[PDB]
């Protein structure tokens, strides 16, 4: 027995309950807490709200770890649990808890305590104070306490020191049950891991770890090494490191080598996801090379958010120079180390013009493989979320639902994301056009369908990358019956419905549309199809017509045997459903295109190219099977989550044999 403590921190994808384990093991250092409280297995997998609430039996404390993806459902769980147990202490923490609660407890009178920011100290003090004959919640630092419906702000939060020396839930065995649950249910999952806390920078849109603009604090060395071995010994294939700037600290290289050696010795992890440092440096490169050799790498972060000087000044971000970015791209490409760059659509002062020009400048600098875009969200505690900032830049938002809602689910259970869809610099019509533009760049250029053609036209015919993809959108949007035109127009109407119908889900957008879901059904059953997944597969379905219609657009540019030759190469290099790894795939060309796109001089040299790819995707785990459309989809585009941009879309030259004729 004892006072039962329930943790709830759910998400649609399985992530081990790190928060619950951290708070529990830190609090249990108090012998009174360890003796009096009976900590329950954390709830982290999604279930119907009523089922989840029914699973909480005689709770003394209900602890909710609240993010944008679970706030509404966890408030509903608390409401139902509070109804049945009037004396349960409901405490909510996490970055969706507002720093300034205001009228929070009027809207959520079933919540009793709000924890602000890092929660170890406050949670331990809460549980300790609850054991007293006269609990004094108004002395607990870093919390706000409900009195009636008023929020009584407690003393300022206390944080852990520069060297964080706290218990590890992994090493203490309290994460064993969560792994077992995932494995019992056959679920792929991520283990969460922190090596430090904080980001030293100040991007106004961001709320990373509730600790931007902060002095960095490190978890102790020995704990981290023990945890690396724990992950490896428990065959955790997928590791998610939460650091804001991996590579920013000298020891990050030693951590990277330790993970590579763990993979070599124990077979795990196989994939490590992490955000790499903003001010990318030699250490980031050394880490990426180490993980490339061990096949742990999921892509080196070289993110920009925006490239426009006024936008960056408005959001308090300094990027590396465009020429330094180009030099980085060359260095990584020479080692075949995958990089990626993120942009945010709708940032303060960003126009459709600057948005498209920035994208083109990134391709110009050498980013052809991985460009990612996110709709700007107003996070509760980001510096950008003030009435003054929103008014100054004219930010207009809609409460955007995140997921498709099963029929019969009450509307107060739908998670919402405060999404910007219009600014003073970007009207909503231009927002829609800009969103479609970069989606097309993703499935056409990153997706390879026109990447080599575009590079050839840029380097031999002076057709700029922005010009090329702007021309595609202008030309084909006026031609509704072409393959590409149908895609542009479907995206235009989708993204206008996306704004006008806040219920259309951010994370299941394709799946929410019956016609788009029907188009992808032969390729697989997924809730998480992305727009660029859908675009890539739609072209795969009508591949031959796509290329005949592409010729007509090329005529409008003033554009020949060499162009005819590179078009055949651009057609053959794409992965197709009939590809057989046993037989391979070969063709003959008037030029050595593999040598050219690897940096060589373009020469009229007749060559035979024989592609012999055996597998695709992360760790080469997807093997094509001719005629099997499901197997083709996995090899071509991988999983929708995690994002699959390494070893996909097209046949690779490293596996190709080029012989002279
Ligand atoms: C891993 C991760 C994910 C995972 C989900 C992880 C999960 N299910 O738990 C995935 C990859 C799915 C994800 C997605 C997104 N994410 Co994310 N993600 C993170 C990341 C890197 C780590 C979260 C984590 O576990 N941290 C480690 C834990 C230990 O720390 P913590 O969250 O700070 O917890 C402490 C305090 O909050 C407090 N606390 C927390 N819970 C509780 C509970 C109680 C009772 C108490 C007392 C205290 C308390 O104590 C903890 C320990 O000190 C964070 C950034 C970060 N470093 O925190 C962003 C972050 C959570 N993501 C964010 C965003 C915006 C998103 C997206 C929604 C949008 C995007 N990125 O473009 C997308 C999803 C979009 C879509 N669906 O298409 C924001 C969320 C802000 C918010 N208000 O929710 C963050 C903070 C990053 C940012 N940009 O500022 N995310
Ligand atoms: C089927 C679902 C879609 C639920 O209906 C389920 O599969 C799910 O919810 N899946 C997570 C999808 C997701 O969160 N996508 C966002 C893009 S990626 C994510 C954010 C980007 C920057 C950073 O650090 N990353 C993270 C990463 O790269 O992991
Ligand atoms: C980790 C990545 O998450 C993105 N990111 C961070 N904060 C936000 C936000 N408020 N809205 C959208 N995307 C965001 C940035 O592109 C960053 O590089
Ligand atoms: C975690 S955000 C992405 C990585 C890095 N901090 C950047 O902004 O470039
Ligand atoms: S975007 Fe990256 S650099 Fe900027 S505040 Fe967030 S974590 Fe720090
Ligand atoms: K803050
Ligand atoms: K260090």
UniProtKB/Swiss-Prot annotation:
Gene Ontology cellular-component annotations: cytosol
Annotated B12-binding domain residues: 1-137
Binding residue positions for 5'-deoxyadenosine: 205, 305, 342, 377
Primary enzyme class: transferase
EC number, UniProt record: 2.1.1.-
Recorded metabolic or biological pathway in which this protein acts: Antibiotic biosynthesis
Requisite cofactors: [4Fe-4S] cluster; cob(II)alamin
Phenotypic consequence of residue 208 to F/A/Y: Markedly slows substrate methylation
Effect of residue 69 to A/F/H: Slight increase in methylation steps
Family annotation (InterPro entries): Cobalamin-bd, Cobalamin-bd_sf, Elp3/MiaA/NifB-like_rSAM, rSAM, rSAM_horseshoe, Tetrapyrrole_Bchl_Biosynth_MTs, ThnK-like
Binding site for cob(II)alamin: 11, 65, 67-68, 96, 119-120, 207, 242
Cofactor note: Binds 1 [4Fe-4S] cluster. The cluster is coordinated with 3 cysteines and an exchangeable S-adenosyl-L-methionine.
Protein residues bound to [4Fe-4S] cluster: 199, 203, 206
Source superkingdom: Bacteria
Keywords: 4Fe-4S, Antibiotic biosynthesis, Cobalamin, Cobalt, Iron, Iron-sulfur, Metal-binding, Methyltransferase, S-adenosyl-L-methionine, Transferase
GO BP: any one term: antibiotic biosynthetic process
MF-aspect GO terms: 4 iron, 4 sulfur cluster binding; cobalamin binding; metal ion binding; methyltransferase activity
Domain Radical SAM core span(s) in chain numbering: 185-410
Family classification: Belongs to the methyltransferase superfamily.
Comment text on domains: The cobalamin- and substrate-binding sites influence overall activity and the relative rates of each methylation step.
Role of this protein: Methyltransferase involved in the biosynthesis of the beta-lactam carbapenem antibiotic asparenomycin. Catalyzes three consecutive S-adenosyl-L-methionine-dependent methylations to build out the C6-isopropyl side chain in a stereocontrolled manner.
Record-given protein name: Cobalamin-dependent radical SAM methyltransferase TokK
Native source organism of the sequence: Streptomyces tokunonensis
Protein encoded by which gene: tokK
């Amino acid at each position: 027995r004892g006072r039962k403590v329930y943790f709830v921190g759910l998400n649609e994808y399985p992530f081990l309950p790190l928060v619950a384990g951290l708070l529990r093991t830190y609090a249990e250092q108090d012998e009174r807490i360890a003796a009096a409280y009976d900590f329950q297995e954390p709830v982290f997998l999604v279930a119907p709200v009523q089922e989840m609430a029914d699973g909480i039996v005689e709770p003394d404390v209900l602890a909710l770890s609240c993010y944008v993806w679970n706030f509404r459902r966890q408030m509903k769980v608390a409401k139902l649990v509070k109804e049945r147990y009037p004396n349960v202490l409901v405490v909510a923490g996490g970055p969706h808890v507002p720093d300034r609660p205001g009228n929070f407890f009027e809207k959520h009178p079933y919540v009793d305590v709000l924890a602000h920011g890092e929660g170890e100290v406050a949670f331990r003090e809460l549980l300790a104070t609850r054991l007293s004959d006269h609990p004094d919640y108004t002395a607990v630092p870093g919390v706000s306490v409900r009195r009636g419906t008023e929020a009584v702000v407690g003393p300022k939060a206390k944080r852990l020191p520069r060297l964080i020396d706290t218990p590890s839930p992994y090493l203490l065995g309290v994460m064993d049950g969560a792994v077992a649950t995932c494995r019992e249910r056959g679920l792929r999952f991520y283990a969460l891991w922190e090596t430090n806390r904080g980001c030293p920078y100040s991007c106004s849109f961001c709320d990373w770890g509730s600790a931007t603009m902060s002095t960095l604090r490190k978890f102790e060395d020995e704990r981290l090494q023990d945890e690396i071995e724990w992950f490896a010994r428990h065959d955790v294939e997928d590791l998610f490191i939460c650091d804001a700037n991996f590579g920013i600290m000298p020891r990050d290289l030693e951590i990277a080598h330790a993970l590579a050696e763990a993979r070599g010795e124990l077979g795990a992890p196989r994939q490590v996801r992490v955000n790499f440092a903003k001010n990318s440096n030699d250490r980031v490169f050394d880490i990426s090379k180490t993980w490339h050799d061990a096949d742990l790498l999921m892509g080196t972060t070289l993110s920009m958010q925006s490239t426009d000087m006024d936008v960056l000044e408005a959001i308090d971000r300094k990027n590396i120079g465009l020429d330094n970015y180009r030099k980085l791209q060359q260095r990584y490409a020479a080692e075949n180390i995958h990089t990626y760059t993120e942009l945010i659509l709708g940032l303060p002062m960003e126009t459709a013009r600057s948005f498209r020009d920035g994208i083109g400048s990134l391709l110009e600098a050498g980013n052809h493989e991985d460009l990612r875009v996110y709709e700007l969200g107003i996070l509760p505690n980001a510096p950008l979320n003030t009435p003054e900032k929103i008014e100054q830049y004219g930010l207009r938002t809609v409460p955007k639902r995140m997921y498709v809602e099963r029929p019969g689910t009450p509307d107060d259970e739908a998670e919402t994301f405060e999404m910007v869809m219009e600014t003073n610099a970007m009207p909503r019509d231009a927002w829609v056009e800009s969103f479609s533009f970069i989606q097309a760049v993703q499935f056409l250029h990153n997706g390879c369908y026109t990447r080599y053609l575009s590079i050839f036209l840029r380097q031999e015919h002076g057709i700029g990358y922005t010009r090329f993809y702007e021309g595609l959108q202008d030309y084909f949007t006026g031609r509704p019956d072409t393959v590409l035109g149908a895609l542009y127009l479907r995206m235009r109407s989708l993204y206008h419905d996306y704004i006008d119908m806040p219920a259309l889900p951010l994370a299941n957008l394709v799946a929410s549309q019956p016609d788009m879901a029907a188009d992808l059904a032969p390729y697989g059953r997924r809730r998480g199809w992305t727009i660029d997944n859908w675009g890539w597969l739609r072209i795969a379905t009508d591949f031959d017509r796509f290329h005949t219609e592409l010729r007509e657009y090329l005529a409008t540019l003033g554009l020949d045997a060499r162009l005819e030759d590179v078009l055949r190469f651009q057609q053959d290099v794409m992965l197709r459903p009939d590809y057989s790894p046993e037989l391979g795939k070969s063709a003959e060309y008037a030029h050595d295109w593999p040598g050219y796109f690897a940096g060589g001089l373009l020469r009229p040299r007749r060559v035979r190219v024989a592609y012999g790819d055996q597998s695709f995707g992360a760790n080469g785990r997807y093997r094509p099977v001719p005629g099997d459309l499901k197997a083709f989809t996995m090899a071509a585009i991988g999983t929708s989550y995690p994002v699959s941009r390494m070893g996909h879309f097209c046949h690779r030259f490293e596996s190709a044999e080029v012989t002279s004729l």
